[model samples]
Target: HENLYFQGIPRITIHAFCARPETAALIEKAAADRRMSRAATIVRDGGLEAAVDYYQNQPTPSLVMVETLDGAQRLLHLLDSLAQVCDPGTKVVVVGQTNDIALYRELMRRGVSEYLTQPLGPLQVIRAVGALYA
Candidate 1:
């Protein structure tokens, strides 16, 4: 008999938005990986703005992954708006161009599930999602 290894993430809805093309590609690739087969994900272009717009008309998913390049100043305001519509059980992961550790802490402290940086790869994306929902 073969050993039974848990191979898929638990069923949940995940939404990702990227301001950069490569980031979008990475998330999309990761979403199709074997480990993610049980979860549903949609990767959209336009970052935090796109998610906020879509969520305004519908319900927020189990997780929101947003990559925003609007820099430090503009992003707080954007995050603020997103929080307004985010449901209580929803989690967020914010990816930025900034590599500041304090900012990462700030994001986590403020309720983000985690903070990620750009130049993403599909393997990294899968691990992060697995880390969250495993």
Candidate 2:
């Protein structure tokens, strides 16, 4: 694990919560990029509530990218409660399996930085995060 400090804040920790190995690997490769050097990534296997807790207690990093098996409905509910602790500037990128374009549009409307389909590759992950970080 590599530790990094962002904007003079030490221990700025990034996290990756992916249920699939390939997705996790893709996120890993993206986080390893030079632009992400100021953000350390942690891999975890657990529920969405656990992730909410992780960000709640830890210093909410400049960015957070997570994947959930839940589709649009579950995400809508989770985001409702998660909004309580979600920092104003936290950039959240969610990976979902839903094919509904409306759900993606809704999530964007609700402040989700990005909504993407699963089975995503390293380059996709790289470009996604790079867009905001750049």
Candidate 3:
């Protein structure tokens, strides 16, 4: 049997909005590596707004991954809107432009599953997810 580092990965539904094609590919491959399937909403464009709008009336996934451009203030506003529609059990991951510690702490304190720095790579995505869901 193949040992899966990411157990229960397939049981989770991941929704991702990547701002770049390369980052999208990395995230897709990382998910695939864990035998997980993810939905790509606004690939190579858009931000948290796209996810917030699309998931408005639909069922929220087990995991929501979004790439956002703006700094802390904008992210907080966008995430507030997202929280309204997100199911209580849904976990949120953010790929952001800023690398501020305060933002990271704030996000985690607010219940975000994880935060990844932009210019992402497959390994980083996989590692982060593994850590978060472990």
Candidate 4:
């Protein structure tokens, strides 16, 4: 896996919501990567809350990347909140601090694109998003 899952995003738009400085900085860096050169991505400040608030009236992009630093239960709860207002076809990638399998299983069972733990880097984020369309 040295090469990893690196692929150019297929022009599908993405929105990343971050709850911390490092996460947003990671996303901002990923957004500026050559892999995303042809894609449209916007990095926001708040994670789940902002996503639920901002998209209630507006349309969603092809993919939504939400980074939350809440506990396992709270993270799951927030995901539930966003799911209620989520579009039918849009993909979801949630970044959190929880490494529990139960929450990840629940999220995957409900069709989340990916569940990633915190302390992410640009390569990891890029590979995650790149693998979505692969």
Candidate 5:
């Protein structure tokens, strides 16, 4: 069946820390369309760092979507920092500029929920988040 179904998203907080305004808007639209009740968007921020700083004193959200311009290693380092402030059950989706498969695999190996290349459509984000529950 090609029909889509969603569950459990409405009960969780979903935040997107976007490096670009357009990306933030797209994530906002996708989350709204999906009825993610606790969704919010932050634009023009250094995503992982901002997330780490903000969440250090607060509880981490259930799902976080962060954008990074850094390549593989730097992104990994940033994620390590994010992990310090992230809850054990938090699911992370990364939006990256590079399309390297090695980087994608590494992020997955490091337990990132998904790695999405830049210029993402709203549907892509919606499906990625939905896939986590599916």
Candidate 6:
């Protein structure tokens, strides 16, 4: 397979499967400062699956972020489906509405990189993405 993956110590492409402009802006800014100045980003406004499909055939990135304002139940359902298609090495992070610790642990157990709740800021996104890539 072609090395569709970003090639560098700090290159990560953030896939923003969110409708919020603020979230998109944050990831852009975060990637701007990372050791990987070469960060690439893709934004899809509504469809989580559509966002995921972008990487289905190519080599997966180091980090993949999907934000859904939906509650945990819906989020988990979508996440489960996404996980099925993702390459095992790809780190998957989810942003959702509920902060339930159980849900967080559940997602973690199910191979998620991290679970973030809604009402997030640019810095929160920066932090989460940084931790995984770092």
- Candidate 6 residue-wise lDDT, 72-117, digit = tens: 6777787777776777668888766666889888888888888777
Per-residue lDDT of 81 in model 3: 92
Across residues 46-92, which tens digit of lDDT does each residue of candidate 2 receive? Answer: 54556777767766666666766766677788777666777767777
Error of 3 at 119 (Å): 3.4
Query: Number of clashes in every candidate structure?
Result: 0, 0, 0, 0, 0, 0
Q: Write the per-residue lDDT of candidate 4 for residues 1-134, one digit (tens) a residue.
A: 23454457788888888898888888889889887888798888878878988888888889999876676677678778888888877899988877788888999997898988887788888888878777
lDDT per residue, candidate 1, 1-134, as tens digits?
12122576678899898898878878888887887888899888888988889888899989899977778767767888999999988989887878897777777777888787877676766667667764
Question: Which prediction has the highest lDDT against the true structure?
Answer: 4
Task: Give the range of the ten consecutive residues with the poorest summed lDDT in model 4.
Answer: 1-10
Candidate 3 vs. true structure, TM-score: 0.80
Candidate 2 regions exceeding 4 Å error are 1-13
Give the CA lDDT, 0 to 100, for residue 18 in model 6: 69
lDDT of 5 by residue, 1-134 (tens): 23254542446677778877777778867766744554553333667768777888888777888876566787799899988788888999998888898888888998999988878877677667767876
| Residue 130 local lDDT, model 2 | 54
TM-score of each: 0.89, 0.78, 0.80, 0.89, 0.84, 0.73
* lDDT measured at residue 41 in model 1 versus the true structure, 0 to 100: 93
Span of 10 residues, lowest total lDDT, candidate 5: 1-10
List residue ranges in candidate 6 displaced over 4 A.
1-9, 34-36, 52-59
After superposing candidate 5, which stretches have Cα over 4 Å from the reference? 1-3, 6-8, 34-44
Clashing pairs for predicted structure model 5, backbone only: none
Question: Per lDDT, what order, best first?
Answer: 4, 1, 5, 3, 2, 6
User: Candidates' lDDT values, in order?
Assistant: 0.80, 0.67, 0.73, 0.83, 0.75, 0.66
TM-score, candidate 4, is 0.89
lDDT of 3 by residue, 28-73 (tens): 6776663344322224357687888887889787778887667689
